[PDB]
Symmetry: C3
Subunit: 651 residues, 3 copies
Amino acid sequence: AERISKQSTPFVGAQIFIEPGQTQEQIEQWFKLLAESNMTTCRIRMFGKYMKTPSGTYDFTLFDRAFKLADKYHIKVYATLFPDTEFTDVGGFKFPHSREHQKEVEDYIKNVVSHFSQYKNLAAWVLINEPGTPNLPFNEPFTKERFSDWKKEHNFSEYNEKGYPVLNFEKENFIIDYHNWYLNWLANQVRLYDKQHDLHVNPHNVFKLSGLYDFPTWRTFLNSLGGSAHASWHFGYFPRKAYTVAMSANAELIRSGAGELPWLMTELQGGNNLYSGANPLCPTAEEIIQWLWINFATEAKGGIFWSFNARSTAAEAGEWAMINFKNKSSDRLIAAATIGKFITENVKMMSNIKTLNSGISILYNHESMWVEAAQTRGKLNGNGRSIGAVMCSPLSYFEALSETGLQANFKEIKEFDFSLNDYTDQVIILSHQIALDNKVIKQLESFVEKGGTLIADGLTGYYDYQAHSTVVSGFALENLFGSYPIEYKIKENLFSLDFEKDYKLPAHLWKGTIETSKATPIMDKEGECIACINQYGKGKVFWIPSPIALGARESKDFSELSKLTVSLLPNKILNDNPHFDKHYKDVMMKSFKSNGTMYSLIINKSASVQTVDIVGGKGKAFILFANKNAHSTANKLTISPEETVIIKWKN
Amino acid sequence: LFQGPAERISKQSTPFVGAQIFIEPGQTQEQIEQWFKLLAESNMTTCRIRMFGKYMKTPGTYDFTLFDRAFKLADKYHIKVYATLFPDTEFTDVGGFKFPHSREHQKEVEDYIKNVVSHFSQYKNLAAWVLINEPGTPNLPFNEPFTKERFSDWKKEHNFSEYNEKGYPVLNFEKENFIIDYHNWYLNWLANQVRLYDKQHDLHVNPHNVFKLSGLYDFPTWRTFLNSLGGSAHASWHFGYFPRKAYTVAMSANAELIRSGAGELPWLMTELQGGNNLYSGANPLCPTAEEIIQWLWINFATEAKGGIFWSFNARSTAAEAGEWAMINFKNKSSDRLIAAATIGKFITENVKMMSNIKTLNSGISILYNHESMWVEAAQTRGKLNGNGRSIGAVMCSPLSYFEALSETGLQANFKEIKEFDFSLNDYTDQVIILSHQIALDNKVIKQLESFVEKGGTLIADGLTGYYDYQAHSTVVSGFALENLFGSYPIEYKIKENLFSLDFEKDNYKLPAHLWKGTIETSKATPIMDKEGECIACINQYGKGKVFWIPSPIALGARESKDFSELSKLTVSLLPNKILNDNPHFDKHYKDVMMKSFKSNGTMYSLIINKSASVQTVDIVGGKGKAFILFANKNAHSTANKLTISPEETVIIKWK
Amino acid sequence: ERISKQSTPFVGAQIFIEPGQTQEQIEQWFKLLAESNMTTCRIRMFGKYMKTPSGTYDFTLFDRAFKLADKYHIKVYATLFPDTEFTDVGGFKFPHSREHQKEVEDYIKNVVSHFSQYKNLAAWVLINEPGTPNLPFNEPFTKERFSDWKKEHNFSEYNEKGYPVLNFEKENFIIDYHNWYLNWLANQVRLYDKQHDLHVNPHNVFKLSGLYDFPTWRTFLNSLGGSAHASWHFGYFPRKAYTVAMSANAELIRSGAGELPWLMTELQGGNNLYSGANPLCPTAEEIIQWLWINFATEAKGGIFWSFNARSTAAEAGEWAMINFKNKSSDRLIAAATIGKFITENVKMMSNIKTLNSGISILYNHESMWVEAAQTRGKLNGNGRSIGAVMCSPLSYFEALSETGLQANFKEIKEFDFSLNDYTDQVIILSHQIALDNKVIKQLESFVEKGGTLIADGLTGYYDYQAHSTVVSGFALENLFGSYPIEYKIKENLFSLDFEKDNYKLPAHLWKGTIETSKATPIMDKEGECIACINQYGKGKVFWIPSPIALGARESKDFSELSKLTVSLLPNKILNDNPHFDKHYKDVMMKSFKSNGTMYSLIINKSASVQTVDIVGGKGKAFILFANKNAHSTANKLTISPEETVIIKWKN
Ligand SMILES: *[C@H]1[C@H]([NH3+])[C@H](CO)[C@@H](O)[C@H](O)[C@@H]1O
Ligand SMILES: *[C@H]1[C@H]([NH3+])[C@H](CO)[C@@H](O)[C@H](O)[C@@H]1O
Ligand SMILES: *[C@H]1[C@H]([NH3+])[C@H](CO)[C@@H](O)[C@H](O)[C@@H]1O
Ligand SMILES: [Cl-]
Ligand SMILES: [Cl-]
Ligand SMILES: [Cl-]
């Protein structure tokens, strides 16, 4: 069996939806067109329901038929373990209902892995479709008992070391461990019967569910990390014109979770929402090209569209499909096929992509999300006093950097390597990460001391991991920030921070004021201290405790956040990295390397032709890919609305 | 002419204006008599009385005194009585329970019916038993043991497979099919209970909120045990899909829907809004005098044998205290009772005309089906965002065609598909509109094929035929309507709530809602858009034609608040016979309606102006010269050009 | 000291005591509290922070605070707060069970026996914020109480005339239950301490007044308190009208107090981060506005929640008057100027008596209870929603404030109907939809003896059993000399245009038409009778059954309601009371006396400097207090935006 690696040739693929009632002739027609569309790979939901016989035997006929047709057309198969469940359960159950249900899942895995492991075109086992749920079944006896046991095996005090009352977030910490346990158990079950094939899983809705996911632990039992990134389900924090930024951030978040493992996008939106989806659309041909290039530029080893063909009955009947109702190519399949073709014509380049890390890392942590949920009491008013602000804030910095043509990592804090001796020319952005503990503050102190630049806005560091505010009891970040908070004063959803001898930064909801000791104060036109720069060892801290990233989001203008961030970056980042000479609204660029050669991905999401002046790095623009005849004069790229451009930098 | 001295309602009965007389303890003889006196002097012949079990129960005997007093005063003033069976229930239960709570409760209802029917059947002024007030509820009591057991029994008596004949997974809509049968069962049982003690009087029932609850109602089965079909059509409860200026269209569609359900049975509007919402109602108003006249004429023009207003007098305590009443707090006439009285007077002065009304059927039938509503509910997961991806699109779509036709002065039927007669040999000059009827089975497609083959015109827009009755999409597995449509769907692509379909020829633009459908023609003639995609087709099929446009253009007209393009398109697809034989407008008129009817050979037209300004409407088609028989604001006509004032109702007699 | 109507008013603040705080921080709070001219603190006596493992009480944490309060001559309001979940911010309102009642008995024994011994104990607060909309009917203690209460009451389903009735068993039980538990808490405290003032702080009074029988509470209290938080309680008002909100809240508590002194136990001292329904940070200007409105309305104190902040989870670092360095915000500096003013004007400030104009705006429990039943709990902010029966009188109150006229705001049972003369007294019953025969007789007596009655909206539509006499035989026909004909629903906003071409009154939702017998009809331009004046004995009735107060609210314009009301007032009120020569949008004035000397409080909440012409009473304006250099020429006051002015009337 071929094992996926960081050197694998990336593929374009699609879900092949198999259910009873389909004919041999239609299934073969799908695989034939899939092969002719320069797609190498399919994914198949191995429905327990469509293998169970009245007598309790497994009948594999329906899936044998699909596997054999895949083999005939040289299509490899991601096989999703999907035990028997209600027809109306679109996504699948996330945990066993009971010990008896766990034994049924054991029996399902034994039967399905023993049989289908024998196919030479099996590429991977997907352990579970879309692990993680917002609504965890605490009512079910399996989960209820696990939670009880877990609580008794942990020693939690109602008071901290200094004697203050604490929250311990038992539920949230259990949920991490519970996901870790069940996925690890699924991996172990598959490994009883098959030690040959890649294990894969697709975390989903990552801007909401990242607080469920311990990706470092998952690396211990996976061969690749996947992802669902559906424009109609997962990008609600963005307008459609910014699904570029959404896909880029989703790619960076999975990339970070993957660490040393290769990653691929297991599930992308391939077609139309009729009745399904939260933010329904039909992806344009242009969007299909944009999403594949963003993922490959971000080291994805694959892009699998849900779906090639449609479900026939009830939920998503005739929805999501890349083929039309005559089983011929939509403009979406035609577009995906040009990327498959491009890969086969540029194998060495496409097989060795490494994202050009600017040195900027935007960090989020589970605990800021958990404290936000407790403090907002689950309010959904889309603002700082609602669930989502601790993710929308870093996503806004990410967007501002994208509109500057700068790559940024998007990482959980435990995925950042704090063990290096030098962080010269490395930048951490902590945007409204409202919960930081002593351990992480010490890591941040080390990082800055050794040359790191730390940018902190919003209520970053207001609470610890027990929702205790050191801002009240004795500020844990006083040392690093060389300053102390004075007040937060709530304002409108959108106000202006007007710096002395003007920046006018858009700010959201709260004005923070500080007192500097070691730091240099920055004053506003009202004579209040609203920010500071602390020189700490070899590094610097910029602290502005008003939410200026959420301000940029609220004002729908990232230009001031771009200019401010650029002015704080070490010169080395601006000299070594291709970026825009200025901020461009609704334009993104990210750069990658493949065997020594540097490339740039440019996408224009504005309503008009843009001329983007690319500066930094070395080389002359050669246009390798452009779906609307983009042209460059020196390093000035003229790019049409919705166009995707790959520049190869020659020399 | 054997089972009763009781007058039995017929399609030949003289229509009446009437009102609820609300009877509760605490009222005096003097006030009740004053109500019946004024009711009689307002040219009303009929009242309806809720026979509250609560106000007859003694510390277990029945005391009938409170209702005897009302029946005797009704009799004294020659007022006939619709008596509503309303068993004992909480004072706070405004509308009444819809089903027994338990086997023990069913026995209490049996005892209630025995006592009340045995006693009040003896009054010579009893016109009808209303079996239940407003059968049907959105929120069915599945948690109560009587319903839970009935559902369990019904499930064990039905054999459902999880797969169809081709092997595909299916939904079976057990809940929805049970609910139809459960309503059928309980109403039939109520009819049987009444018939144990009285075989002389008309059985009546008033289905309500029909644009939402039609999926609960099997009117063909109800005909089996009713003598007349009723209806509640309240401007404050039932017309949420319409602005107030289109309550004319709402009432006309509600009348057509009940008319269709009635079939051979006479029908009447059991419950119309007679007065003011204080705290009650979803879309509160006080009907204008003009609105009262509009609603009575729309119903009579649509073959109603009665209009009964809720209410003559008001409830006194809590819910709807001093609300809904046609009389003011001094028990004298509001402008609403004075207006209703002019229609009562008109009827007594034109008995033969008013007793024999038959709606002039244009030949256009707008069809809805239970199953499109049920599949919509499952697919939209009960979303209430008032659009294609919400509950109500499958009804708002046909209602939009209906509105477009009303603004063209054309009658259209509004019928459940099982109420349409598919058994005829000729459908020349007949038109079916299937607007966003997303669920169609093989049986109905065969009926539609027969209909078109024999000369029928089929107009289909939106996602009509996307699913079958098991929510299986033949669009995915093998399109069941390919033969009839002479074409095949290619894609739906979601767009904004309002977009334009830009036709390749003639620079022609249709408002469309939410989804753009593209097709491939085989036998049909393709119609292309400016982007070179096929968006519609005309299939010639035997003697008939099919127009198919799988974008929602009716919902597009609704979203744009403009039915003028939908009017022009529909008119251009009608057989010439419909335009030549039927009075209609020479063009589309925004916020004007006309419907025509016949009575013993003579043709009439009803015209209502709901616009802000005086309109001159050019009436064309049929034969005759306009004579203005009824006009509440001095309408005048020159030849067949009618000048009609805002909120005016006009009846033209064609000489 | 025992509090009296002659006590010197104080400024004070909550001192929030929890484990983890140091001696040094607590002392620093009391030191700054003393230096801020604050004499009083309030301390939550958390049962949780006195319970030891063994069930003994350890008082150490509160001893430390009491002793530091004593050292700085700070008196203490001690709040009885039994053991409860850390997450319970406001405290439980009733015992959970008979066993929990015994724990509360033991808590009171231990805490009152111990802390009664401190010489700086000013008051026991029996319970923090009595009243909850949602009573725990599920819990056995409340379930049994309701069962017992129901068996002790005989309710008939019909009235005397035979009509069906509602009896509001739940609402009547809830009044009696609050009466019972507070009385029981008072009796428990009195078992161990007969020396100290008993106090309680009713809250959210514009919503919870239907829970509160203040006349009964007088029997076991020495003072009535109040929570009046801008972020929780003033939802019916924009921020620019929090002056009117505080004035109405002060009047409502003052009325409940009767002969008892009252003080505002809980005012907003600082910032909402995540807490509050209508979040803000009070301005310095707002702090001064609220203290003066309360003192002008006879308050013996203003206690801010809070001096210092909670440290963990709910309201962590929120509400505090001190900043995170434990120094003065502009809010503490502002509060300190009022403390200083009091020490420099002891005799004036100790003897304040509100100058009663003679205008009383009456609300009743029963209008609120019938509204809840008729609106079925709808929250659409209009006549068909919960809150109209309170927003309506609050709108008259606002119109009178913008005329510079004091008005009482009273529950109908708090109005003295037993006098022989009501010459030059005015009652406004605005949309008080429920009136019984007893109250109609009191209103007949009041008008007969010279009273002026103003009734708008659906006043008197129902009786106390939600039976409408408008339908069965109008109970107010005699007093009104007229009969309702119809209500007709209209738009949210329409105009009642009087035929005499004077008044064009904004009206909300319903147009009422009437038939006059004894009364003089007032016709509108459409030829309908919309109002009347009835001469009844020596008094007059103005009846307009359209909601013109809710009309003024909906139009955000109280000017026509002001002019109409002024034209109906007895001459004596206009001659004897300082008021404005005309209506001033977003300006308030209320007047008070201290011994013989008359004063006026003027606040400008408009965006611009106003010149207000004060007329009525006697004297020349001398500016005693002004925080933005107000000046007067004769009796014309020039007052800046957000400025508070006290005028002393010299002669
Ligand atoms: C992912 C995605 N959610 C599809 C479209 O909603 C769904 O049908 C499948 O269950 C995939 O897991
Ligand atoms: C019909 C209608 N719902 C009336 C107004 O709400 C009501 O009083 C009656 O109970 C009928 O339900
Ligand atoms: C009063 C007020 N509700 C405070 C602020 O929300 C709260 O912390 C206190 O518990 C008091 O209830
Ligand atoms: Cl899958
Ligand atoms: Cl009835
Ligand atoms: Cl307290």
